[PDB]
Design a protein around this ligand. Structure first.
Ligand SMILES: CCCCC/C=C\C/C=C\C/C=C\C/C=C\CCCC(=O)O
Ligand SMILES: CCCCC/C=C\C/C=C\C/C=C\C/C=C\CCCC(=O)O
Ligand SMILES: CCCCC/C=C\C/C=C\C/C=C\C/C=C\CCCC(=O)O
Ligand SMILES: CCCCC/C=C\C/C=C\C/C=C\C/C=C\CCCC(=O)O
Ligand SMILES: CCCCC/C=C\C/C=C\C/C=C\C/C=C\CCCC(=O)O
Ligand SMILES: CCCCC/C=C\C/C=C\C/C=C\C/C=C\CCCC(=O)O
Ligand SMILES: CCCCC/C=C\C/C=C\C/C=C\C/C=C\CCCC(=O)O
Length: 582
């Protein structure tokens, strides 16, 4: 059209427009103060209205990158504040934009945002709803420069709904606090995946991404033809590359096009898409990527027909290897919404290895006739891990379950730092209560989704401060062997127990006054240290001590006097325990 700005403004709306411009600026100029960005939003919004009124008004012809880049080069303190970035302004548009992206610090040194008290938040919320939500939106976006703007916006609205609903509530805190905690994990989760997918695209390459995509798309759109899914995988790939490069605009448009396409061919893709395709521009993509799995045909053949029994397997495979394998995945994935994507990838890989060995042999058909029997243990391994662990989780609670993981993993890798072992086990415990409440058919997909960010995140830490070659092995293994590699870690026999330190096992009454989350962490921290000191202790000896510790706490908190109790009894405990563990 004549004017891009006019257009976006029109089919986005002033409110969303202002919010997005704010986010965009906050993401590039992470150092400027809030009031400075607000001024810019106003100036750009005014500009936009001018173009809405006259498509032919001065500058309205300009493109968004050009417009955006100019206003950016407006900042006076630019060179004094961002040094090198200012040199970008000396370049022509294409390079200019490109130059800005390269100076977008993916993780600056800003203070960690602290959460104020419910009352202050609620009061601030009512006194000026807008600047309240905008300032935080500003704080969050400058700290997460690669977070897709429209999604950052979707979160903000949920946050607003929570304040509306809770700042009116009798027990404000009992209402809000838990809603905020949940919103945070989801936001941190969303953020981690975002970074995760792009890192993956980098390491593993396009081939691996396409495969991951085929499987994923097929589980969701089981009724679509392979031609459609191929078309989608291709476009989805252009979209991820684009979106990972960091260019918001190009990223947003590619996502827009892909959504409208899907919505138009909605009949040849899925039936669970009606709701999503009825929503406004800003939310279509988001809705679609979240859509529920559509139901499969029921009148579907057996894979063995076309992939095992049918002579020609090799002729068709040699004709177009990745395509044939893509077909295998499509076929296998859409009949199994219950498998994690990586499991599907492991089957496809096993099948590829086989076709490679068999198609170059005397009698093909007989060499690969029993390939499906190889899939069995591959499918059963993950299945049994879920079952065993979910059963254990039902017996104990999220808490006692977290302590079980603590003992278990401290033993595998004692070298690991205590605060890290506690962080990880608690998150694992969360995943436990999150996914174990689903029925078997949805358990594996669930665990995969959560376990992937947890696994990825723990690998980076170790990347920063390696402690074990074993972990490094698993962390640099193939995307398909990662989890299995970690599952295979057995007890570290080499390890030498930490020498006893009386301080580590000393407790004062300050634990009677502490809160749940605090008491637990302190108990769990002591637990890891206990195992690091006596790694050969049985699950029995250990439970014994833990039980003695159970009383100790009580027989000292609910006591006529703390301090003393924790000093007299405390000495007794260490002595007893020390003895019962050689
Ligand atoms: C850090 C999570 C990242 C996801 C957040 C995404 C969007 C939020 C942006 C604006 C919401 C406005 C106000 C939120 C209020 C408090 C946030 C403190 C974070 C926490 O609850 O401790
Ligand atoms: C341009 C048309 C493309 C459509 C076909 C779609 C996907 C084909 C590409 C790959 C799928 C084939 C096998 C996957 C097997 C193992 C995972 C790859 C991981 C790796 O590499 O270790
Ligand atoms: C004069 C300065 C111009 C800079 C303006 C900066 C940002 C506003 C421009 C576009 C807004 C970005 C995305 C919105 C477009 C489509 C909906 C999201 C696509 C999707 O995911 O479905
Ligand atoms: C992922 C699974 C399904 C998503 C399919 C289509 C959504 C289209 C555009 C959004 C891109 C999100 C990355
Ligand atoms: C839903 C189970 C949540 C419990 C998780 C708690 C602790 C972790 C311990 C074991 C891991 C359990 C299951 C992992 C199996 C499959 C995950 C999908 C990835 C893959 O196919 O490799
Ligand atoms: C700096 C990071 C150091 C790594 C230490 C962190 C955790 C302990 C070691 C390995 C990973 C343990 C659990 C991760 C979650 C699921 C995979 C294991 C599945 C299983 O149990 O079958
Ligand atoms: C030779 C070393 C002996 C030192 C023994 C001294 C103190 C015990 C050490 C650690 C504490 C042990 C268990 C507490 C942690 C979790 C159990 C849950 C308790 C509960 O809430 O139910």
């Amino acid at each position: 059209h004549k004017s891009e700005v006019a257009h976006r403004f029109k089919d986005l709306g002033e409110e969303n427009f202002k919010a997005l411009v704010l986010i965009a600026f906050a993401q590039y100029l992470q150092q400027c103060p809030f009031e400075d960005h607000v001024k810019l939003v106003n100036e750009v919004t005014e500009f936009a209205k001018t173009c809405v009124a006259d498509e032919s008004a001065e500058n309205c012809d300009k493109s968004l990158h050009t417009l955006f880049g100019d206003k950016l080069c407006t900042v006076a303190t630019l060179r004094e504040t961002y040094g090198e970035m200012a040199d970008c302004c000396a370049k022509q548009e294409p390079e200019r934009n490109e130059c800005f992206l390269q100076h977008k610090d993916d993780n600056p040194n800003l203070p960690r945002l602290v959460r104020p008290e419910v009352d202050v938040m609620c009061t601030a919320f009512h006194d000026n709803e807008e600047t309240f939500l905008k300032k935080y939106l500003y704080e969050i976006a400058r700290r997460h420069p690669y977070f897709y703007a429209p999604e950052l916006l979707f979160f903000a609205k949920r946050y607003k709904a929570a304040f509306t609903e809770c700042c009116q509530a009798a027990d404000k805190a009992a209402c809000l606090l838990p809603k905020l905690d949940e919103l945070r994990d989801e936001g941190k989760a969303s953020s981690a995946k975002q970074r995760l997918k792009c890192a993956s695209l980098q390491k593993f390459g396009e081939r691996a991404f396409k495969a991951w995509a085929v499987a994923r798309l097929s589980q969701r759109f089981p009724k679509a033809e392979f031609a459609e899914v191929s078309k989608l995988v291709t476009d989805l790939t252009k979209v991820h590359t684009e979106c990972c490069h960091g260019d918001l605009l190009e990223c947003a448009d590619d996502r827009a096009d892909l959504a409208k396409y899907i919505c138009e061919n909605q009949d040849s893709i899925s039936s669970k898409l009606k709701e999503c395709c009825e929503k406004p521009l800003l939310e279509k993509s988001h809705c679609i990527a979240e859509v529920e799995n559509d139901e499969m045909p029921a009148d579907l053949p057996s894979l063995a027909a076309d992939f095992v029994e049918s002579k020609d397997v090799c002729k068709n495979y040699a004709e177009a290897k990745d395509v044939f394998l893509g077909m295998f995945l499509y076929e296998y994935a859409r009949r199994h919404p219950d498998y994690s994507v990586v499991l599907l990838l492991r089957l496809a890989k096993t099948y590829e290895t086989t076709l490679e060995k068999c198609c170059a042999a005397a009698d093909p058909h007989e060499c690969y006739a029993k390939v499906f029997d190889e899939f069995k243990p591959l499918v059963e391994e993950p299945q049994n891990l879920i079952k065993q662990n979910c059963e254990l989780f039902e017996q104990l609670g999220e808490y006692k379950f977290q302590n079980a993981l603590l003992v278990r993993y401290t033993k595998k890798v004692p070298q690991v730092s205590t605060p890290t072992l506690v962080e990880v086990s608690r998150n694992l415990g969360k995943v436990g209560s999150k996914c174990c409440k689903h029925p078997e058919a949805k358990r594996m997909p669930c665990a995969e989704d959560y376990l992937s960010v947890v696994l990825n995140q723990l690998c980076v830490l170790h990347e920063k401060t390696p402690v074990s070659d074993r972990v490094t092995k698993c962390c640099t293994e193939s995307l398909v062997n990662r989890r299995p590699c970690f599952s295979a870690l057995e007890v570290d026999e080499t390890y030498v127990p930490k020498e006893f330190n009386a301080e580590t096992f000393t407790f004062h009454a300050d634990i009677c006054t502490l809160s749940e989350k605090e008491r637990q962490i302190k108990k769990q921290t002591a637990l890891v240290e206990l195992v690091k000191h006596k790694p050969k202790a049985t699950k029995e000896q250990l439970k014994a001590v833990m039980d003695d510790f159970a009383a100790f706490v009580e027989k000292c908190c609910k006591a006529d006097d703390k301090e003393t109790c924790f000093a007299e009894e405390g000495k007794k405990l260490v002595a007893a325990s020390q003895a019962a563990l050689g």
